[PDB]
Design an enzyme around this catalytic site. Structure first.
Site, short mmCIF file in Angstrom:
data_model
loop_
_atom_site.label_atom_id
_atom_site.label_comp_id
_atom_site.label_asym_id
_atom_site.label_seq_id
_atom_site.Cartn_x
_atom_site.Cartn_y
_atom_site.Cartn_z
N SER A 111 -18.78 87.28 33.59
CA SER A 111 -18.96 87.38 31.94
C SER A 111 -18.13 86.50 30.99
O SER A 111 -17.23 85.82 31.75
CB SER A 111 -18.59 89.00 31.70
OG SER A 111 -17.16 88.94 31.76
N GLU A 112 -18.37 86.45 29.80
CA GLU A 112 -17.42 85.77 28.72
C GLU A 112 -17.43 86.90 27.79
O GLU A 112 -18.15 87.64 27.24
CB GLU A 112 -18.42 84.43 28.23
N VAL A 113 -16.08 87.07 27.17
CA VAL A 113 -15.60 87.94 26.40
C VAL A 113 -15.12 87.34 24.91
O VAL A 113 -14.24 86.29 25.06
CB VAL A 113 -14.47 88.61 26.95
CG1 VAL A 113 -13.77 90.00 26.17
CG2 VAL A 113 -14.85 89.38 28.40
N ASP B 99 -12.55 98.85 41.85
CA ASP B 99 -11.95 97.63 41.86
C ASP B 99 -10.81 97.75 40.98
O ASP B 99 -10.39 96.92 39.88
CB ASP B 99 -13.16 96.61 41.01
CG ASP B 99 -12.80 95.22 41.12
OD1 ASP B 99 -11.79 94.91 42.18
OD2 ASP B 99 -13.31 94.15 40.58
N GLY C 201 -11.66 85.45 26.56
CA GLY C 201 -11.42 84.93 27.80
C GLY C 201 -12.77 85.01 28.48
O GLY C 201 -13.73 85.15 28.04
N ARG C 202 -12.77 84.41 29.87
CA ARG C 202 -13.99 83.91 30.56
C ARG C 202 -13.83 84.54 31.83
O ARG C 202 -12.72 84.43 32.49
CB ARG C 202 -14.18 82.63 30.47
CG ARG C 202 -15.63 82.10 31.25
N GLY C 203 -14.81 85.25 32.74
CA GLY C 203 -14.69 85.65 34.03
C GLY C 203 -15.97 84.71 34.62
O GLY C 203 -16.66 83.92 34.09
N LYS C 204 -16.29 84.99 36.05
CA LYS C 204 -17.06 84.32 36.86
C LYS C 204 -18.67 85.35 36.61
O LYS C 204 -19.57 84.84 36.97
CB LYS C 204 -16.94 84.33 38.24
#
Ligand SMILES: Cc1cnc2c(S(=O)(=O)N3CCC(CCNCc4ccc(-c5ccccc5)c(Cl)c4)CC3)cccc2c1
Length: 331
Positions: free
Chosen positions: A49-51, A154, A44-47
Site C-alpha cells: 500500500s501507499e498511505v 501480524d 508512508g509507503r509499503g510493499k
C-alpha cells in the site's frame, strides 16, 4: 496425524453470528465517490500500500487514505469485512469509506484521521511506565478483536501506531487477519518471522487467537531488553533455533509430543539440545530500568510453546505488570 486443538476463549463466537459476519466471500463492496477525497500528502509507503493524508471535500474532514497495491480480491474482501466488523472497537483504526482509485484502478480505504509520532524520537525517551501503558492499550485492541472472532496474525511494531502527545494508540494492517473457527486449519506462512509463534514454525495449522499473544510477547521482550528483534532468526529454521536456545528444547519436544506433531527428523538434529535459560541473562545496565519481576513473570506467561497455556488478552490485562496503569486509568 496431529491432535486437534481449540481456543480456550471466544471459541464459538462466530458460530453464533449470522453467516454473513464471517463469510466475507459473499460481501458486496458498495464503493463511495472518489471525488469526495483529495489527497494532500504522502505519509508512508509499503510493499502492499501507499498511505496519504487527504481531505473529505464534502465536509472538510481530515482523513487518511490507504491505496492498496494489487492483492487477491478474496484477501481485500477479508480485510474490508474485518475492518467493518471491528469498527468502533478500542484502538482499532476506524474505516470511514471505500473508494476506487482512478489511476491504479485499485481500492482505497479511507480512515478517520490518525496521527503517528515518529517512533525514533520516542524510543530513547520511553519509560517503564510508558511501555506498560501502551502494552495495555494494545491488549484492549486484541481482547476486542479476539472477542469479535478475529485473529490479527501480524502483531509487530510496524503495525502499532502511537500518538504520544495525546496518549493514543492504534492497531493497523488487518490484511493478514482471519476469522477463528474451531477445527479450521490455517496457513502457517503468516506474521513476520521474528513474531511467528512456534505453532507456525513447526507447521501446526489448527491455531487460534493465542498466536497474537506470542507475537505480543516478542514485542515486550524487544522493548524491555532493548533488542529489536528479540528472536532474530535469519531464516524460518534458525528462527525456531533462536527460540529454543532461550526456552530450551525439552519444552519444545514436550509440545510436539502433546499435539502429535510430525517434524522432519532433520529439524530435530539442527534443533539439538538446549537448556532453558533464565530471563535474567538478557538484563544489562542499558535495559535494567525497563525490567521488573512483574515484567519477567508476564513475559514468561506469554512466551510458552503450548499455545493453550499462554495468557489470553483478558488474563494479561489483569496481570500485576499493569496494576498501577489500571489504577491510574481509573484515576
Ligand atoms: C492506517 C494508517 C496506516 N499508515 C499510516 C502511517 S505510515 O504508514 O506512515 N506508518 C505506518 C505505521 C508505522 C508505525 C510505527 N510504530 C512505532 C511503535 C509504536 C508502538 C510501539 C510500542 C508498543 C508497546 C510498548 C511500547 C511501544 C513500538 Cl515498539 C513501536 C509508522 C508509519 C502514518 C500515519 C497514519 C497512518 C494510518
Amino acid at each position: 496425524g496431529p491432535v486437534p486443538s481449540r481456543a480456550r476463549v471466544y471459541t464459538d463466537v462466530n458460530t453464533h453470528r449470522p453467516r454473513e459476519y464471517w463469510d466475507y466471500e459473499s460481501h458486496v463492496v458498495e464503493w463511495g465517490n472518489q471525488d469526495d477525497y483529495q489527497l494532500v500528502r504522502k505519509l508512508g509507503r509499503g510493499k502492499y500500500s501507499e498511505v496519504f493524508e487527504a481531505i473529505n471535500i464534502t465536509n472538510n474532514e481530515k482523513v487518511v487514505v490507504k491505496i492498496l497495491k494489487p492483492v487477491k480480491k478474496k484477501k481485500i474482501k477479508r480485510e474490508i469485512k474485518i475492518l467493518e466488523n471491528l469498527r468502533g472497537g478500542p484502538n482499532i483504526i476506524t474505516l470511514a469509506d471505500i473508494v476506487k482509485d482512478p489511476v491504479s484502478r485499485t481500492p482505497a480505504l479511507v480512515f478517520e484521521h490518525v496521527n503517528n509520532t515518529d517512533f525514533k524520537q520516542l524510543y530513547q525517551t520511553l519509560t517503564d511506565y510508558d511501555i506498560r501503558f501502551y502494552m495495555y492499550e494494545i491488549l484492549k485492541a486484541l481482547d476486542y478483536c479476539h472477542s469479535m472472532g478475529i485473529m490479527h496474525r501480524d502483531v509487530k511494531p510496524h503495525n502499532v501506531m502511537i500518538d504520544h502527545e495525546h496518549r493514543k494508540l492504534r492497531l493497523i494492517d488487518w490484511g493478514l487477519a482471519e476469522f477463528y473457527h474451531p477445527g479450521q486449519e490455517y496457513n502457517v506462512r503468516v506474521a513476520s518471522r521474528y513474531f511467528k509463534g512456534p505453532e507456525l514454525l513447526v507447521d501446526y495449522q489448527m491455531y487460534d487467537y493465542s498466536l497474537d499473544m506470542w507475537s505480543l510477547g516478542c514485542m515486550l521482550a524487544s522493548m524491555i531488553f532493548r533488542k529489536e528483534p528479540f528472536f532474530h532468526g535469519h531464516d524460518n529454521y534458525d528462527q525456531l533455533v533462536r527460540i529454543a536456545k532461550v526456552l530450551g528444547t525439552e519444552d519444545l519436544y514436550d509440545y510436539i509430543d502433546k499435539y502429535n506433531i510430525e517434524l522432519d527428523p532433520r529439524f530435530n538434529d539442527i534443533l539439538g539440545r538446549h537448556s532453558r535459560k533464565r530471563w535474567e541473562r538478557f538484563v544489562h545496565s542499558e535495559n535494567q530500568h525497563l525490567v521488573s519481576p512483574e515484567a519477567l513473570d508476564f513475559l514468561d506467561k506469554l512466551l510458552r510453546y503450548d499455545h493453550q497455556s499462554r495468557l489470553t488478552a483478558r488474563e494479561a490485562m489483569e496481570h500485576p505488570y499493569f496494576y498501577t496503569v489500571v489504577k491510574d486509568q481509573a484515576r
